[PDB]
Design a protein around this ligand. Structure first.
Ligand code: SAH
Ligand code: SAH
Lengths: 617, 303, 274, 328
């Protein structure tokens, strides 16, 4: 189903036009609530004392019809940013009149077009009307993808770049402080900008897409047909689930308006199958949550089910145990050598079964210890134990750091990796479990490394900015990491290796306190909003997992990236360098991160002493 | 095979062992009744003479005459099973779902034709085993009924104790059959009661604290209480002696035996879980068998 | 359209019982997540070191089933306000254990019965569990309209309405009127006055428990309630609460409930506050 | 707010305040005096060396009070002065290398983690707060109990906290003004305060709350406590909270107490503590006041939870230590 509406220039009889467009296949009508030519005076007689109604009554339609069927249109003669004082003052009074009446009707949406770069006075009037109580009305800002002056035919002798209208919307939304009630209604022209420009448009809260009747080509049968260039844009709009609006006269083709709606429905049922997408669908697209802490907290069964849904992590770990066994016990010791394998953090099973099947695949005998601190998960572990596994697997309930193993192990297998690698405190857990590993023991994973990359995302920043909770630091939201998605931000430079942890750690004095300065060069004029965090790991030799951007290793869909926000966003030029100071602290009771930007502008240290964010034990 | 948690153990008047087991941890919470003419063969199901699985878990079992077996089920039903001896078969005669909750206990009168039921639904029901139906249902307890004990030689008198802290003496002739017995430190919750075979108006009771008490209904001021265990008494049983000993089991995984003067004589720490059954041997008057949730069927002897 | 559930004391087979109660016309099932007799030690050997599973795993049902079909029931042997120190300790450990397991399964509701006036330690443990992470679990408090000691038969020769209300009020006040804490009333053979009834209805009731023993047998061997009980069902109807059928089969009692609905006496800004 | 010498390292000025009371010094010196004479006879006047350990030595005072108690009793002692505060250890090693000598061994670290190379006869500590155990004295001594001999004596041997229903519109409004930004606007009512006696009016005689004895010879050592204290009101007043006192037994008959009508010395050694209430309760005479009081220990934090169940049932204050906790 594709919801669509009709953009009319004017309406004589409202009841007639509704039923007319309703039988065409439309779901709503974009009409003005005041006559587009009914220009009016406010401050000067005799035009000031104009008798009669200002516009048609509200009793023409029911409240139900006003709330669901009608999208109001602002008059075009209203120019609140005219350099003429008389015009501006008149437009300001006219602006407030139609806005208050649109809210009076209970309109779900209201159309306000942007025709220039300077809409400062427009913003002031709009966010005012939202603040004086009248709300619940979405504001569709009609902005064309291409400026009207850039789409006109070169027909002038004495008067013969595409991010021009982007500035119109960006400056307007910024002035409106990224208000929730303000949406975007793109208008598609004959010419389209770059694909990257389009991808930036689609990042914005697009609620509607205007399809002029003049962009449709007439097929040899007389049916409205879009070009292949436009079709790809429509396809991208389909997954955003936006509504389409047909504007203009249908007399550009030999058919009626319904044919335009049938063609869109035709493209919908013939739209390409989505992959490299749908992982997140439908969806973790706007995922902005805090990283889970399986150590400080006991995960739910539903939560485990999500982690156990990725066959890649299961395969790679099974492959790791497969190769590790064959490498530490030869063929002549095929039955006289029993490898002692310990699954540290067994969860509900998967890692234990992946180790058992890896033993059968390698034809090696293993003695399994399945340890877990989550009492609820142990209940699940002892289900497999007394039904499937047997006495070869010993289920242990407790912390691996406190558990006293009655037998040293050859192989320890754990999956305590977070989105940033060590953010789930994998090092601390394995370090306290290192003592019962043999002198020649192998740890899976053997090592892992976190990565940081400077990003730009006004979308993600404003989402974090809205995460202000009561009864705490009003800026605490900027001093904590978030689990996000790749398509929600734009990476400004290639990620650099941050912290590296190897197991077993054979250092003199084991310390998990880390510090590094990562520098990146900016090649664009953009705004720094924070840093994306990725990680890669080596389970066994050559068998790896990674969520790094341009990694050829499997596991790209096994973890969402992490985000370290910034308090004061930094607008940067090209040629600038970005040095970030990153700390990983461990006071014995808590573990946290501290970060600061020292280039180009020197910011402040975020989350000092873990005042806003910590990780348990 | 037999479930892990063994619930009860009863001796028959020839040496036959009657044990009940239930599954309380696995995916299927059922139960099973077993009869061992060779007690030393327990709990090996291969050495039994008859075994059958019930629809649900079994809380308590009792011998009816010689061939009949009563069963208290989780389904809130009382089941009478008969032993088709040397057919290696156990056949149900009736299962009446009279209780609205788990039947925690049941005792059989001396005549072997009547019985009393203790339910988690606060209900106390006297049964007519011959007519396969109940006689009268009593709602005197305001909480779960822990233990019931028919008075030997009297087919109208029995005891009962519940979580309401009441120990009721019964007489199904009076319009108000129940009579609450009180003594020193009776404020606790009684968990087990049993009649003294050689003393009139005298019974032994235990609480959830660990105390085993000897109470004479007439003159309760001379009641002897002793901190025998540290947790809930899960069963009491007197021996077949002229001056019977009192065997006590509890959740502290211990089995103790007191004499007539209420002094400790025997104590076994062999059990590795909740010992839930105890019964003296009709053949050897020094021998008594205890069962627990460790799937152990241990036999003991007096010094 | 009358949403009903079934209260069971013990389940021998989860998969079989669910389908069995589905054929009867029940929507959800009130069952214990731990065996009601399976008591356990937490501090003293050797019972502390008991091997094997504590209960049946979460893999018996799908996540969908646990979140929609199952209402957990707290073990009755757990007494967190026992005057015995050892018992109070054990109950506190068992209380936390079962509360954590109910949240692990993702249960929509969990039954916690109130059997006395003193439930101080229970409220302390409950609001702690709510505050420590675990969420999205409604807590149904089983409270009878009349005390069990006030509904028993006068059979004790030496021992011959506002009571249970204090049980609920004191507990809710102690819990600071937490949103995750609702009420699940249990209807006895004797009902309190009309005013008291209306006061109970003011409380966030999410379920009404109907014992099978309060139903009378009609001429044609059919379940029937007195008019006194009927008027209460009529008031519970306009609160859209769920009805749970408890007790022995000796099971389409829901027919009489639907019968009382189809033919119910005629009469939503009632909560509204701005 | 009550000081936490365990979670925090006290300043030198802070120590100077605690060391200003001659009563605590005298009673502790008297305790060591009597304890020595009782565990080593006159015929073992020089052949028996008592191993004494000052757990939480501070800046000195307790060590000197033990040395002078050894000379007063004419007994020989081997002293171990342990402290976790690195700054205080600097002061301890000043006395060590100028006055004391090799008879006193200064140890820097936690008594719960320190591995003693020699079991002790007597352990002396002063980890008592205004409410007795609010400075986590039990937890510290429990973790230091292992290196005490089987017949070892702990000073203090026991201590007990007390609670009493009070009335103070003055103290209540002072707490009400303690609303800080960026936190629960009612959190101030869910935390104890160190106050003075004359600022409130006691409504009933204090009852014994929690009791801790050392060394704890229980089967499973648990510091989680719970009790219901009931008081009868004889006036028409308003309940604003509960005052907290404590008494302790250093050695036999030698005691310290801050209880209202106590005849034991130490009445000026500690200020009382106050557990406020959110909703003040106006009460008549004849009314009873039952208060439920909890002491919780989750392994990482220790705190108190309290609730009033009579005459009016209030709510549980500081649930799960959401407003107030004590470190380790
Ligand atoms: N110190 C410790 N001792 C024992 N088990 C632990 C532990 N730390 C973590 N675990 C267990 O190890 C499991 C880690 S699950 C981690 C999921 C993984 N980060 C992912 O997103 O795919 C948890 O079930 C937890 O219970
Ligand atoms: N676990 C521990 N290990 C070592 N020293 C400790 C300790 N806990 C406390 N201490 C030390 O013992 C001293 C307690 S000072 C307490 C002062 C007392 N409450 C009063 O008000 O008078 C502190 O200097 C502290 O450093």
């Amino acid at each position: 189903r594709v919801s669509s509406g009709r953009d009319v220039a004017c309406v004589t009889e409202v009841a007639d036009t509704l039923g007319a467009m309703a039988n065409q296949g439309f779901d709503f009508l974009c009409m003005p609530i005041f006559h587009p030519r009914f220009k009016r005076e406010f401050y000067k007689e005799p035009a000031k004392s104009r008798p009669g109604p200002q516009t048609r009554s509200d009793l023409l339609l029911s409240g139900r019809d006003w709330n669901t069927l009608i999208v109001g249109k602002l008059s075009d003669w209203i120019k609140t940013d005219s350099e003429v004082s008389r015009i501006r003052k008149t437009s300001e009074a006219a602006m407030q009149q139609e806005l208050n009446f649109s809210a009076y009707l209970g309109l779900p949406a209201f159309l306000i077009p942007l025709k220039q770069e300077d809409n400062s006075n427009l913003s002031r009037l709009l966010i005012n009307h939202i603040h004086v109580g009248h709300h619940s009305t979405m504001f569709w800002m009609r902005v064309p993808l291409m400026a009207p002056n850039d789409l006109r035919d070169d027909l002038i002798e004495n008067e013969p770049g595409e991010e021009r209208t982007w500035i119109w919307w960006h400056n307007f939304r910024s002035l409106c402080d990224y208000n929730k009630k303000i949406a975007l209604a793109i208008e598609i022209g004959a010419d389209l900008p770059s694909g990257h420009v389009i991808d930036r448009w689609l990042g914005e809260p697009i609620k509607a897409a205007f399809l002029p009747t003049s962009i449709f080509l007439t097929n040899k049968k007389g049916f409205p047909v879009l070009t292949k260039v436009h079709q790809r844009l429509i396809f991208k709009l389909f997954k955003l689930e936006v509504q389409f609006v047909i504007s203009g006269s249908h007399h550009h083709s030999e058919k009626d308006l319904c044919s335009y709606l049938q063609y869109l429905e035709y493209l919908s049922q013939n739209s390409p199958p989505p992959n490299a997408y749908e992982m997140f669908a439908k969806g973790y697209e706007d995922y902005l949550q805090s990283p889970l802490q399986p150590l400080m907290d006991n995960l739910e069964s539903q939560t485990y089910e999500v982690f156990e849904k990725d066959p890649v992590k299961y395969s790679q770990y099974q492959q790791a145990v497969y190769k590790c066994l064959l490498d530490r016990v030869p063929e002549e010791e095929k039955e006289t050598n029993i490898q002692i394998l310990m699954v540290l953090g067994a969860g509900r099973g998967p890692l234990v079964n992946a180790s058992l099947r890896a033993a059968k695949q390698a034809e090696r005998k293993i003695k399994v210890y399945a340890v877990e601190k989550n009492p609820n998960a142990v209940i699940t572990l002892e289900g497999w134990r007394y039904e499937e596994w047997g006495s070869q697997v010993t289920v242990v309930s407790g912390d691996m750091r406190e558990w006293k193993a009655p037998e040293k192990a050859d192989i320890i297998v754990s999956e305590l990796l977070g989105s940033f690698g060590d953010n789930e405190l994998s090092p601390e857990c394995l370090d306290g479990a290192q003592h019962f590993l043999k002198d020649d023991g192998v740890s899976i994973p053997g090592e892992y490394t976190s990565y940081l990359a400077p990003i730009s995302s006004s979308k993600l920043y404003n989402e974090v900015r809205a995460c202000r909770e009561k009864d705490r630091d009003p800026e605490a939201q900027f001093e904590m990491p978030y689990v996000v998605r790749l398509h929600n931000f734009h990476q400004l430079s290639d990620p650099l290796p941050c912290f590296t942890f190897h197991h077993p750690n054979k250092d003199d004095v084991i310390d998990n306190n880390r510090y590094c300065c990562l520098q990146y060069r900016v090649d664009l004029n953009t705004v720094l909003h924070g840093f994306a965090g990725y990680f890669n790991t080596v389970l066994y030799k050559d068998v790896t997992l990674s969520i790094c951007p341009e990694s050829h290793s499997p596991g790209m869909f096994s973890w969402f990236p992490i985000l370290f926000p910034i308090k004061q966003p930094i607008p940067m030029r090209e040629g600038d360098t970005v040095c970030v100071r990153f700390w990983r602290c461990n006071n014995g009771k808590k573990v946290w991160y501290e970060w600061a930007v020292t280039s180009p502008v020197c910011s402040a240290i975020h989350n000092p002493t873990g005042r806003s964010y910590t990780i348990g034990l | 095979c037999m479930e892990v948690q063994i619930g009860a153990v009863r001796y028959r008047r020839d040496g036959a062992l009657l044990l009940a087991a239930s599954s309380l941890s696995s995916r299927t919470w059922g139960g099973s009744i077993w009869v061992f003419k060779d007690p030393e063969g327990a709990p090996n199901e291969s050495l039994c003479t008859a075994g059958v699985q019930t629809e649900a878990g079994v809380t308590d079992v009792a011998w009816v005459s010689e061939k009949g077996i009563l069963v208290a089920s989780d389904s809130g039903a009382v089941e009478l099973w008969e032993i088709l001896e040397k057919e290696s078969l156990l056949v149900n005669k009736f299962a009446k779902y009279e209780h609205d909750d788990i039947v925690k206990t049941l005792s059989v009168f001396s005549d072997g034709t009547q019985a009393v039921s203790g339910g988690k639904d606060f209900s106390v029901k006297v049964w007519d085993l011959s007519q396969k139906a109940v006689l009268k249902s009593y709602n005197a307890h305001s909480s779960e009924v822990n233990c019931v004990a028919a008075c030997p030689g009297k087919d109208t008198i029995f005891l009962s104790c519940g979580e309401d802290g009441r120990i009721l003496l019964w007489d199904t002739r009076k319009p108000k059959p129940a009579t609450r017995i009180d003594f020193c430190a009776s404020d606790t919750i009684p968990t087990s009661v049993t009649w003294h075979p050689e003393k009139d108006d005298t019974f032994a009771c235990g609480d959830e604290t660990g105390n085993v008490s000897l109470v004479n209904i007439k003159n309760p001021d001379s009641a002897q209480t002793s901190a025998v265990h540290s947790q809930n008494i899960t069963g009491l049983a007197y021996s077949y002696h002229s001056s019977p000993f009192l065997a006590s089991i509890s959740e502290d995984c211990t089995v103790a035996v007191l004499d007539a003067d209420f002094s400790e004589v025997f104590r076994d720490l062999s059990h590795r879980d909740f010992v839930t059954g105890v019964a003296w041997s009709p053949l050897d008057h020094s021998k008594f068998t205890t069962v627990g949730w460790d799937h152990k069927v241990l036999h003991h002897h007096l010094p």
